[PDB]
């Protein structure tokens, strides 16, 4: 009952037990909470209430020191003191933002907004306020028991009367029971066990319901600025293909920690391991928040590090497949890849953190914790996807608030740019510099004259929330019998349930823009679906068009995408 005042630090006995994290608040602060708030239980070593029998007086307002105990006002003693006076409640070693992130339900955009401009310590305040509001709200979906099982890759699914049914994406990892965690897709569910077992009619699943760790390092260790490369040792033999990065590089080791911005196609991966070939002695650990994220970096890694001093960390609990060419599980090889919620207790002379926009501030208070080092590499694109927020359903959420590294990204700007796309066709590149990068983005390639718009709103209909355009499938179809070199596209959607259709109807291999995101194919096919606020979010209509390498028809909903896209149109 001994802790920090989480605003100011002044040590106290009082946490709020109204805050459902039971924050620490100094005297001072925890009056200005009590005061303004619907929280009126103050805890100590023992709860401010009446200790009067039978009396359920817990209003810290309401009660009184009586001698050593505490009374409300119709059973304290005649010398008795107001818990709460002088803007102060009684307690030993004897503001706005702390109250509205305390009391707010995360459904707001505000929410997010205030929880990325507030102090460091409000930040992990609420990011943890946030965390825990995420995993006690997953107790509120109903549970899905087995009817019938058609095959081994599809069943169906009797669901619990009088409490809601949770969409069926990929994003919500169900765990059946304890025979391991569990995926749907959309009267046939398909059913992908992370763990094989022939699924049982009867059996159950339920949504993975994880305890929230408390937080201690900031989201951002303190900035530091040297006048020479520190503790770290640079080469003078360092390969062509990196010469590009050196002065960037040299930035690297001249500061605590650096914040770069790479659009689509710019060289992340090919920057975060040539990071190690510049600092060829130096011990870095790569960690991202997605299984992707950390393969991608390891496949680059494979190309141009030591496969022996490379391992891949992989949680025990082990639940989609990943990278396997390196040492499984060595924490203390040179080079460790591992996901942020997997990562040890270790040390290194830089942390590379990639897919930095994917990132919540959670993950960048976790990774200071778990990770002791002399520098910290931010790589991603706040042009770029966010993090899933399950319960902001109000307000868009602008780059800016994604975190802490966004939001300098999008103030002060980020340390380093790669200017430079080298994946896109010309029209994309020109379309996305506009549209999100201040036209700072510059092409390599030619225009490929292979990249085409079609205005086609066509008719949509819901698999639930889940969106579906079956005319802009139909188009979809008709070109590609008098384009049958896109008969390889990867067709890309903002809708699982588009993605569903698209499947059967087209045969081409699928994917949401979301988890397109990391990913490139020579030929994309992007149907928008609909014109809402998800499919015309110009950081995922930025990540869709920029998948391609060579060709991408996109089929627009939207009169102002579709306007800016610089690509040939084409009729029907
Ligand atoms: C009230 S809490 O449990 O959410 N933790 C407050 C966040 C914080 C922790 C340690 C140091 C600085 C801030
Ligand atoms: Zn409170
Ligand atoms: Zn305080
Ligand atoms: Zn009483």
Same mark, same amino acid.
């Given at each position: 009952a001994v802790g920090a005042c989480v605003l100011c630090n002044s040590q106290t006995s009082l946490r709020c037990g109204a805050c459902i994290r039971r924050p620490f608040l100094c005297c001072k602060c925890c009056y200005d909470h009590v005061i303004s708030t619907s929280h009126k239980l103050v805890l100590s070593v023992n709860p401010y209430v009446c200790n009067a029998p039978g009396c359920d007086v817990t209003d810290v307002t309401q009660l009184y020191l009586g001698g050593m105990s505490y009374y409300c006002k119709s059973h304290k003693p005649p010398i008795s003191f107001p818990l709460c006076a002088n803007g102060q409640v009684f307690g030993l070693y004897k503001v706005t933002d702390f109250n509205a992130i305390a009391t707010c339900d995360w459904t707001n955009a505000g929410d997010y907004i205030l929880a990325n401009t507030c102090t460091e310590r409000l930040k992990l305040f609420a990011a943890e306020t946030l965390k825990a509001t995420e995993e006690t709200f997953k107790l509120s979906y109903g549970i899905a028991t087995v009817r019938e099982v058609l095959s081994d890759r599809e069943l169906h699914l009797s669901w619990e009367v009088g409490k809601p049914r949770p969409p069926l994406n990929r994003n919500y990892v169900f765990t059946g029971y304890q025979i391991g965690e569990y995926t749907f897709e959309k009267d046939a569910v398909v059913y992908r066990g992370t763990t094989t077992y022939k699924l049982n009619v009867g059996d159950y699943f339920v949504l993975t319901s994880h305890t929230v760790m408390p937080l201690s390092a900031p989201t951002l260790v303190p900035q530091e600025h040297y006048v020479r490369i520190t503790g770290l040792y640079p080469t003078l033999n360092i390969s062509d293909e990196f010469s590009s990065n050196v002065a960037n590089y040299q930035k690297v080791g001249m500061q605590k920690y650096s914040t770069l911005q790479g659009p689509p196609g710019t060289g992340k991966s090919h920057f975060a391991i040539g990071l190690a070939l510049y600092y060829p002695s130096a011990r870095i650990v790569y960690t991202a928040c997605s299984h992707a994220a950390v393969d991608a970096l390891c496949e680059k890694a494979l190309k141009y590090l030591p496969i022996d001093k490379c391992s891949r960390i992989i949680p025990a609990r082990a639940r989609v497949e990943c990278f396997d060419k390196f040492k499984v599980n060595s924490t203390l090889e040179q080079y460790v890849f591992c996901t942020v919620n997997a990562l040890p207790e270790t040390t290194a002379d830089i942390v590379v953190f990639d897919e930095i926009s994917m990132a919540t501030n959670y993950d960048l208070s976790v990774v200071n914790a778990r990770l002791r080092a002399k520098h910290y590499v931010y790589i991603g694109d706040p042009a770029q996807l966010p993090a899933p927020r399950t319960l902001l359903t109000k307000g868009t959420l602008e780059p800016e608030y994604f975190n802490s590294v966004c939001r300098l990204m999008k103030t002060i700007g980020p340390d380093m740019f790669l200017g430079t796309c080298r994946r896109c066709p010309a029209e994309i590149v020109d379309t996305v510099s506009a549209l999100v990068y201040d036209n700072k983005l510059k092409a390599? %390639?030619? %225009?490929?004259?292979q990249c085409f718009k079609m205005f086609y709103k066509g008719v949509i209909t819901h698999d639930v929330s889940s969106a579906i355009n079956r005319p802009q499938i139909g188009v979809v179809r008709e070109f590609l019998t008098r384009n049958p070199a896109w008969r390889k596209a990867v067709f890309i959607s903002p809708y699982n349930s588009q993605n569903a259709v698209a499947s059967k109807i087209l045969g081409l291999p699928t994917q949401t823009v979301d988890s397109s995101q990391g990913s490139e194919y020579d030929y994309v096919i992007f149907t928008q679906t609909t014109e809402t606020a998800h499919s015309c979010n110009v950081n995922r209509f930025n990540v869709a068009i920029t998948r391609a390498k060579v060709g991408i028809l996109c089929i627009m909903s939207d009169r102002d995408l579709y306007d800016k896209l610089q690509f040939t149109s084409l009729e029907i």
């Open positions: 390599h %390639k030619d %225009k490929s004259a």
